[PDB]
Ligand binder design. Structure first.
Ligand code: FMN
Ligand code: MG
Length: 375
Protein backbone atom coordinates (compact mmCIF):
# COMPACT_ATOMS: atom_id res chain seq x y z
CA UNK A 1 0.00 0.00 0.00
CA UNK A 2 0.79 3.78 0.21
CA UNK A 3 -1.06 6.49 2.13
CA UNK A 4 0.18 9.36 -0.08
CA UNK A 5 -1.45 8.21 -3.33
CA UNK A 6 -4.56 7.02 -1.48
CA UNK A 7 -5.35 10.64 -0.50
CA UNK A 8 -4.90 12.24 -3.95
CA UNK A 9 -6.61 9.62 -6.09
CA UNK A 10 -9.52 8.81 -3.67
CA UNK A 11 -11.90 11.15 -5.56
CA UNK A 12 -11.39 9.86 -9.15
CA UNK A 13 -13.98 6.99 -9.12
CA UNK A 14 -12.93 5.25 -12.39
CA UNK A 15 -11.37 1.72 -12.49
CA UNK A 16 -7.64 2.18 -11.96
CA UNK A 17 -4.65 0.86 -10.01
CA UNK A 18 -1.14 2.20 -9.37
CA UNK A 19 1.80 -0.27 -9.06
CA UNK A 20 5.34 0.11 -7.63
CA UNK A 21 7.94 -0.92 -10.20
CA UNK A 22 10.64 -0.58 -7.47
CA UNK A 23 9.34 -3.56 -5.49
CA UNK A 24 9.55 -7.20 -6.60
CA UNK A 25 6.98 -8.01 -9.27
CA UNK A 26 5.47 -4.50 -9.64
CA UNK A 27 2.83 -5.01 -6.89
CA UNK A 28 -0.40 -2.98 -6.76
CA UNK A 29 -0.02 -0.12 -4.22
CA UNK A 30 -3.42 1.58 -4.74
CA UNK A 31 -6.66 0.31 -6.15
CA UNK A 32 -9.69 2.45 -6.77
CA UNK A 33 -13.09 1.70 -5.24
CA UNK A 34 -14.51 1.39 -8.78
CA UNK A 35 -11.82 -1.25 -9.54
CA UNK A 36 -12.72 -3.01 -6.27
CA UNK A 37 -16.40 -2.98 -7.38
CA UNK A 38 -15.65 -4.17 -10.97
CA UNK A 39 -13.34 -7.06 -9.89
CA UNK A 40 -15.18 -8.03 -6.67
CA UNK A 41 -11.95 -8.49 -4.64
CA UNK A 42 -11.42 -6.46 -1.45
CA UNK A 43 -8.61 -3.89 -1.01
CA UNK A 44 -6.75 -6.39 1.25
CA UNK A 45 -6.95 -9.19 -1.33
CA UNK A 46 -5.53 -6.83 -4.02
CA UNK A 47 -2.76 -4.69 -2.44
CA UNK A 48 0.76 -6.09 -2.71
CA UNK A 49 -0.19 -8.30 -5.67
CA UNK A 50 0.76 -8.20 -9.37
CA UNK A 51 -2.43 -7.44 -11.40
CA UNK A 52 -2.15 -10.74 -13.39
CA UNK A 53 -4.82 -12.30 -11.13
CA UNK A 54 -7.46 -10.81 -13.47
CA UNK A 55 -6.12 -13.15 -16.20
CA UNK A 56 -7.74 -16.49 -17.24
CA UNK A 57 -8.18 -19.10 -20.00
CA UNK A 58 -9.96 -17.05 -22.73
CA UNK A 59 -7.32 -14.25 -22.22
CA UNK A 60 -5.27 -13.77 -25.41
CA UNK A 61 -1.71 -14.61 -24.24
CA UNK A 62 -0.41 -12.53 -27.22
CA UNK A 63 -2.24 -9.40 -26.04
CA UNK A 64 -0.85 -10.00 -22.52
CA UNK A 65 2.72 -9.94 -23.97
CA UNK A 66 2.05 -6.50 -25.52
CA UNK A 67 1.59 -5.25 -21.87
CA UNK A 68 4.80 -6.98 -20.68
CA UNK A 69 6.64 -5.31 -23.59
CA UNK A 70 5.22 -1.88 -22.61
CA UNK A 71 6.13 -2.31 -18.95
CA UNK A 72 9.61 -3.51 -19.84
CA UNK A 73 10.12 -0.72 -22.40
CA UNK A 74 8.53 1.82 -20.00
CA UNK A 75 6.06 3.04 -22.61
CA UNK A 76 2.28 3.47 -22.55
CA UNK A 77 -0.03 0.93 -24.22
CA UNK A 78 -3.77 0.58 -24.89
CA UNK A 79 -5.05 -2.95 -25.45
CA UNK A 80 -8.33 -4.94 -25.37
CA UNK A 81 -8.42 -8.26 -23.53
CA UNK A 82 -10.82 -10.63 -21.68
CA UNK A 83 -10.53 -10.40 -17.86
CA UNK A 84 -12.14 -12.32 -14.93
CA UNK A 85 -13.64 -11.20 -11.62
CA UNK A 86 -12.99 -12.82 -8.14
CA UNK A 87 -16.01 -15.08 -8.72
CA UNK A 88 -14.97 -16.13 -12.25
CA UNK A 89 -17.38 -13.82 -14.20
CA UNK A 90 -15.62 -13.06 -17.55
CA UNK A 91 -15.72 -9.41 -18.86
CA UNK A 92 -13.93 -7.33 -21.57
CA UNK A 93 -11.13 -5.00 -20.49
CA UNK A 94 -10.15 -1.99 -22.59
CA UNK A 95 -6.89 -1.52 -20.65
CA UNK A 96 -4.51 1.53 -20.65
CA UNK A 97 -1.00 1.46 -19.20
CA UNK A 98 0.68 4.78 -18.55
CA UNK A 99 4.02 5.28 -16.77
CA UNK A 100 3.96 8.07 -14.15
CA UNK A 101 7.19 10.05 -14.81
CA UNK A 102 8.97 12.73 -12.64
CA UNK A 103 10.29 16.14 -13.98
CA UNK A 104 13.63 14.49 -15.02
CA UNK A 105 11.38 12.08 -17.11
CA UNK A 106 12.17 8.92 -15.07
CA UNK A 107 9.32 6.38 -14.27
CA UNK A 108 8.08 6.35 -10.63
CA UNK A 109 4.85 4.32 -10.76
CA UNK A 110 2.54 2.69 -13.35
CA UNK A 111 -1.09 3.78 -13.93
CA UNK A 112 -3.47 1.13 -15.25
CA UNK A 113 -6.93 2.24 -16.32
CA UNK A 114 -9.60 -0.40 -16.96
CA UNK A 115 -12.78 0.17 -18.96
CA UNK A 116 -15.16 -2.72 -18.71
CA UNK A 117 -17.15 -3.68 -21.81
CA UNK A 118 -19.57 -6.55 -22.49
CA UNK A 119 -17.84 -7.21 -25.91
CA UNK A 120 -14.60 -6.31 -27.89
CA UNK A 121 -15.49 -2.81 -29.17
CA UNK A 122 -14.07 -1.59 -32.55
CA UNK A 123 -13.76 1.26 -35.14
CA UNK A 124 -15.15 4.73 -34.01
CA UNK A 125 -16.44 3.29 -30.70
CA UNK A 126 -12.95 1.87 -29.89
CA UNK A 127 -11.39 5.28 -30.78
CA UNK A 128 -13.98 7.13 -28.65
CA UNK A 129 -13.17 4.96 -25.57
CA UNK A 130 -9.40 4.95 -26.10
CA UNK A 131 -9.43 8.78 -26.15
CA UNK A 132 -11.43 8.74 -22.89
CA UNK A 133 -9.19 6.28 -20.89
CA UNK A 134 -6.15 8.22 -22.11
CA UNK A 135 -7.78 11.38 -20.66
CA UNK A 136 -8.45 9.46 -17.36
CA UNK A 137 -4.82 8.39 -16.93
CA UNK A 138 -3.78 11.99 -17.81
CA UNK A 139 -5.94 13.20 -14.87
CA UNK A 140 -4.73 10.53 -12.43
CA UNK A 141 -1.16 11.67 -13.26
CA UNK A 142 -2.08 15.35 -12.69
CA UNK A 143 -4.02 14.55 -9.52
CA UNK A 144 -0.86 12.89 -8.06
CA UNK A 145 1.37 15.69 -9.42
CA UNK A 146 -0.78 18.34 -7.67
CA UNK A 147 -0.94 16.35 -4.43
CA UNK A 148 2.87 16.14 -4.44
CA UNK A 149 3.09 19.98 -4.78
CA UNK A 150 0.50 20.51 -2.01
CA UNK A 151 2.59 18.21 0.26
CA UNK A 152 5.79 20.17 -0.38
CA UNK A 153 3.96 23.42 0.52
CA UNK A 154 2.56 22.11 3.87
CA UNK A 155 6.06 20.67 4.63
CA UNK A 156 7.87 23.99 4.09
CA UNK A 157 5.06 25.85 5.96
CA UNK A 158 5.78 23.43 8.90
CA UNK A 159 9.55 24.18 8.65
CA UNK A 160 8.71 27.95 8.60
CA UNK A 161 6.76 27.73 11.91
CA UNK A 162 9.65 25.84 13.61
CA UNK A 163 12.32 28.27 12.33
CA UNK A 164 10.13 31.29 13.32
CA UNK A 165 9.73 29.72 16.82
CA UNK A 166 13.52 29.03 16.93
CA UNK A 167 14.36 32.74 16.30
CA UNK A 168 16.44 31.64 13.23
CA UNK A 169 15.57 34.27 10.64
CA UNK A 170 18.35 33.18 8.20
CA UNK A 171 16.53 29.85 7.81
CA UNK A 172 13.10 31.52 7.30
CA UNK A 173 14.52 34.00 4.71
CA UNK A 174 15.94 30.94 2.79
CA UNK A 175 12.80 28.73 3.23
CA UNK A 176 10.49 31.46 1.93
CA UNK A 177 12.37 31.74 -1.38
CA UNK A 178 11.83 27.93 -1.95
CA UNK A 179 8.14 28.29 -0.88
CA UNK A 180 7.73 31.19 -3.32
CA UNK A 181 8.74 28.77 -6.12
CA UNK A 182 6.44 25.90 -4.92
CA UNK A 183 3.54 28.43 -4.90
CA UNK A 184 4.72 29.61 -8.36
CA UNK A 185 4.66 25.98 -9.72
CA UNK A 186 1.42 25.03 -7.96
CA UNK A 187 -0.57 27.67 -9.83
CA UNK A 188 1.12 26.76 -13.18
CA UNK A 189 -0.13 23.11 -12.67
CA UNK A 190 -3.46 24.31 -11.21
CA UNK A 191 -4.02 26.20 -14.49
CA UNK A 192 -2.82 23.19 -16.58
CA UNK A 193 -5.38 20.93 -14.82
CA UNK A 194 -8.15 23.58 -15.02
CA UNK A 195 -7.83 23.62 -18.82
CA UNK A 196 -7.63 19.75 -18.99
CA UNK A 197 -10.77 19.30 -16.85
CA UNK A 198 -12.67 22.18 -18.52
CA UNK A 199 -13.13 24.24 -15.35
CA UNK A 200 -13.89 27.65 -16.99
CA UNK A 201 -14.28 29.58 -13.66
CA UNK A 202 -11.03 28.13 -12.23
CA UNK A 203 -9.25 29.28 -15.45
CA UNK A 204 -10.68 32.83 -15.14
CA UNK A 205 -9.92 32.98 -11.36
CA UNK A 206 -6.26 31.85 -11.62
CA UNK A 207 -5.55 34.18 -14.58
CA UNK A 208 -7.40 37.03 -12.70
CA UNK A 209 -5.19 36.30 -9.65
CA UNK A 210 -1.96 36.53 -11.69
CA UNK A 211 -1.39 33.12 -13.33
CA UNK A 212 0.83 33.28 -16.44
CA UNK A 213 -1.36 32.28 -19.44
CA UNK A 214 1.81 30.67 -20.99
CA UNK A 215 3.24 28.96 -17.88
CA UNK A 216 4.23 25.49 -18.87
CA UNK A 217 5.17 22.39 -16.96
CA UNK A 218 8.79 21.07 -17.18
CA UNK A 219 7.85 19.28 -20.39
CA UNK A 220 6.70 22.39 -22.25
CA UNK A 221 2.94 21.90 -21.86
CA UNK A 222 0.98 25.19 -21.87
CA UNK A 223 -2.70 25.48 -20.75
CA UNK A 224 -3.61 26.08 -24.45
CA UNK A 225 -2.17 22.60 -25.36
CA UNK A 226 -4.45 20.91 -22.77
CA UNK A 227 -7.49 23.02 -23.58
CA UNK A 228 -6.99 22.08 -27.27
CA UNK A 229 -6.59 18.35 -26.46
CA UNK A 230 -9.81 18.43 -24.31
CA UNK A 231 -12.24 20.28 -26.58
CA UNK A 232 -12.74 23.39 -24.48
CA UNK A 233 -13.48 26.24 -26.91
CA UNK A 234 -14.23 28.76 -24.15
CA UNK A 235 -10.96 28.16 -22.19
CA UNK A 236 -9.05 28.24 -25.57
CA UNK A 237 -10.65 31.60 -26.44
CA UNK A 238 -10.03 32.95 -22.82
CA UNK A 239 -6.32 31.91 -23.04
CA UNK A 240 -5.97 33.49 -26.50
CA UNK A 241 -7.65 36.74 -25.26
CA UNK A 242 -5.21 36.75 -22.30
CA UNK A 243 -2.36 36.64 -24.86
CA UNK A 244 -1.28 32.98 -25.05
CA UNK A 245 1.18 31.73 -27.64
CA UNK A 246 -0.82 29.85 -30.31
CA UNK A 247 2.47 28.34 -31.69
CA UNK A 248 3.85 27.07 -28.34
CA UNK A 249 5.80 23.85 -28.62
CA UNK A 250 6.41 21.32 -25.90
CA UNK A 251 9.60 19.15 -25.39
CA UNK A 252 8.26 17.03 -28.33
CA UNK A 253 7.63 19.92 -30.76
CA UNK A 254 3.88 19.46 -30.40
CA UNK A 255 1.77 22.58 -30.86
CA UNK A 256 -1.84 23.21 -29.59
CA UNK A 257 -2.87 22.66 -33.27
CA UNK A 258 -1.27 19.20 -33.41
CA UNK A 259 -3.32 18.21 -30.32
CA UNK A 260 -6.49 19.77 -31.77
CA UNK A 261 -6.02 17.70 -35.05
CA UNK A 262 -5.21 14.52 -33.04
CA UNK A 263 -8.27 14.86 -30.72
CA UNK A 264 -10.71 15.49 -33.56
CA UNK A 265 -11.96 18.82 -32.21
CA UNK A 266 -12.93 20.62 -35.40
CA UNK A 267 -14.06 23.93 -33.83
CA UNK A 268 -10.81 24.43 -31.90
CA UNK A 269 -8.67 23.88 -35.09
CA UNK A 270 -10.57 26.66 -36.87
CA UNK A 271 -10.09 29.11 -34.00
CA UNK A 272 -6.37 28.33 -33.63
CA UNK A 273 -5.73 28.79 -37.36
CA UNK A 274 -7.93 31.96 -37.18
CA UNK A 275 -5.40 33.24 -34.54
CA UNK A 276 -2.09 32.45 -36.33
CA UNK A 277 -1.39 28.70 -35.94
CA UNK A 278 1.31 27.28 -38.26
CA UNK A 279 -0.57 24.67 -40.41
CA UNK A 280 2.79 23.11 -41.29
CA UNK A 281 4.43 23.04 -37.83
CA UNK A 282 6.29 19.74 -37.42
CA UNK A 283 6.90 17.80 -34.20
CA UNK A 284 10.17 15.90 -33.33
CA UNK A 285 9.04 13.08 -35.67
CA UNK A 286 8.21 15.43 -38.58
CA UNK A 287 4.42 15.11 -38.26
CA UNK A 288 2.41 18.13 -39.20
CA UNK A 289 -1.26 18.48 -37.98
CA UNK A 290 -2.25 17.00 -41.45
CA UNK A 291 -0.29 13.81 -40.63
CA UNK A 292 -2.15 13.57 -37.26
CA UNK A 293 -5.55 14.16 -38.88
CA UNK A 294 -4.88 11.34 -41.42
CA UNK A 295 -3.55 8.76 -38.92
CA UNK A 296 -6.42 9.24 -36.45
CA UNK A 297 -9.41 9.03 -38.77
CA UNK A 298 -10.44 12.69 -38.57
CA UNK A 299 -12.08 13.14 -41.97
CA UNK A 300 -13.47 16.68 -41.34
CA UNK A 301 -10.22 18.32 -40.06
CA UNK A 302 -8.10 17.41 -43.15
CA UNK A 303 -10.42 19.46 -45.48
CA UNK A 304 -10.06 22.49 -43.17
CA UNK A 305 -6.25 22.15 -42.68
CA UNK A 306 -5.48 21.93 -46.43
CA UNK A 307 -7.59 25.11 -47.02
CA UNK A 308 -5.12 27.10 -44.81
CA UNK A 309 -1.80 26.08 -46.46
CA UNK A 310 -1.19 22.44 -45.44
CA UNK A 311 1.28 20.62 -47.69
CA UNK A 312 -0.65 17.46 -48.75
CA UNK A 313 2.77 15.84 -49.54
CA UNK A 314 4.35 16.46 -46.11
CA UNK A 315 7.14 14.10 -45.17
CA UNK A 316 7.35 12.71 -41.61
CA UNK A 317 10.77 11.39 -40.31
CA UNK A 318 10.19 8.16 -42.30
CA UNK A 319 9.21 9.99 -45.53
CA UNK A 320 5.48 9.26 -45.13
CA UNK A 321 2.77 11.53 -46.43
CA UNK A 322 -0.82 11.74 -45.10
CA UNK A 323 -1.79 9.59 -48.19
CA UNK A 324 0.43 6.78 -46.80
CA UNK A 325 -1.01 6.70 -43.14
CA UNK A 326 -4.55 6.69 -44.49
CA UNK A 327 -3.97 3.39 -46.43
CA UNK A 328 -1.81 1.68 -43.73
CA UNK A 329 -4.59 1.99 -41.10
CA UNK A 330 -7.29 1.17 -43.69
CA UNK A 331 -9.43 4.31 -43.44
CA UNK A 332 -11.17 4.09 -46.83
CA UNK A 333 -13.06 7.44 -46.92
CA UNK A 334 -9.82 9.30 -45.91
CA UNK A 335 -7.68 8.03 -48.84
CA UNK A 336 -10.39 9.23 -51.26
CA UNK A 337 -10.65 12.71 -49.77
CA UNK A 338 -6.85 13.05 -49.50
CA UNK A 339 -6.12 11.89 -53.08
CA UNK A 340 -8.85 14.30 -54.33
CA UNK A 341 -6.76 17.22 -53.02
CA UNK A 342 -3.71 16.31 -55.22
CA UNK A 343 -1.81 13.72 -53.12
CA UNK A 344 1.06 11.77 -54.77
CA UNK A 345 0.26 8.04 -55.27
CA UNK A 346 3.88 7.32 -56.24
CA UNK A 347 5.41 8.82 -53.09
CA UNK A 348 8.58 7.27 -51.68
CA UNK A 349 8.66 6.52 -47.94
CA UNK A 350 11.95 5.26 -46.25
CA UNK A 351 11.45 1.81 -47.84
CA UNK A 352 10.36 3.21 -51.22
CA UNK A 353 6.75 2.21 -50.35
CA UNK A 354 3.65 3.83 -51.82
CA UNK A 355 0.05 3.82 -50.44
CA UNK A 356 -0.82 0.53 -52.31
CA UNK A 357 2.14 -1.37 -50.79
CA UNK A 358 1.22 -0.49 -47.15
CA UNK A 359 -2.41 -1.49 -47.98
CA UNK A 360 -1.60 -5.05 -49.24
CA UNK A 361 0.94 -5.54 -46.38
CA UNK A 362 -1.78 -4.84 -43.74
CA UNK A 363 -4.56 -6.98 -45.29
CA UNK A 364 -6.75 -3.93 -46.34
CA UNK A 365 -8.01 -5.40 -49.63
CA UNK A 366 -10.69 -2.79 -50.34
CA UNK A 367 -8.36 0.20 -49.78
CA UNK A 368 -5.63 -1.28 -52.04
CA UNK A 369 -8.27 -1.53 -54.82
CA UNK A 370 -9.47 2.08 -54.51
CA UNK A 371 -5.76 2.94 -55.09
CA UNK A 372 -5.00 1.01 -58.33
CA UNK A 373 -8.42 2.08 -59.68
CA UNK A 374 -7.92 5.66 -58.28
CA UNK A 375 -4.52 6.16 -60.06
C1 FMN B 1 -0.65 -0.46 -13.40
C2 FMN B 1 -0.86 -1.84 -13.97
C3 FMN B 1 -2.16 -2.33 -14.08
C4 FMN B 1 -2.41 -3.59 -14.62
N1 FMN B 1 -3.73 -3.97 -14.81
C5 FMN B 1 -3.95 -5.10 -15.42
C6 FMN B 1 -5.32 -5.47 -15.71
O1 FMN B 1 -6.31 -4.76 -15.56
N2 FMN B 1 -5.46 -6.71 -16.28
C7 FMN B 1 -4.44 -7.56 -16.60
O2 FMN B 1 -4.73 -8.68 -17.00
N3 FMN B 1 -3.15 -7.18 -16.42
C8 FMN B 1 -2.92 -6.01 -15.86
N4 FMN B 1 -1.63 -5.59 -15.70
C9 FMN B 1 -0.53 -6.27 -16.41
C10 FMN B 1 0.05 -7.47 -15.66
O3 FMN B 1 0.32 -7.11 -14.31
C11 FMN B 1 1.32 -8.01 -16.32
O4 FMN B 1 2.22 -6.95 -16.63
C12 FMN B 1 1.06 -8.88 -17.55
O5 FMN B 1 0.33 -10.04 -17.16
C13 FMN B 1 2.30 -9.24 -18.34
O6 FMN B 1 3.33 -9.74 -17.46
P1 FMN B 1 3.38 -11.30 -17.04
O7 FMN B 1 3.44 -12.13 -18.32
O8 FMN B 1 4.55 -11.46 -16.12
O9 FMN B 1 2.07 -11.62 -16.37
C14 FMN B 1 -1.34 -4.38 -15.05
C15 FMN B 1 -0.04 -3.91 -14.91
C16 FMN B 1 0.22 -2.64 -14.40
C17 FMN B 1 1.64 -2.14 -14.41
MG1 MG C 1 4.18 -6.21 -13.96
Amino acid sequence: GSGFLAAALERIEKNFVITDPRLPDNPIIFASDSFLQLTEYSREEILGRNARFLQGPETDRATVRKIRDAIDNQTEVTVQLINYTKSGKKFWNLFHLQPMRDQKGDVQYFIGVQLDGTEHVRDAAEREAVMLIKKTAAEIDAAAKLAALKAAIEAIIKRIEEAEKNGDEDKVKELREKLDKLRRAYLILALLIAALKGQIEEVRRLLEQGADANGADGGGTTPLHLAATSGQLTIVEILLRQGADVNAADNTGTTPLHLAAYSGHLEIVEVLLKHGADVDASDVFGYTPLHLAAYWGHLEIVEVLLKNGADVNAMDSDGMTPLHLAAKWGYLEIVEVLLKHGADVNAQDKFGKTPFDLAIDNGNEDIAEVLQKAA
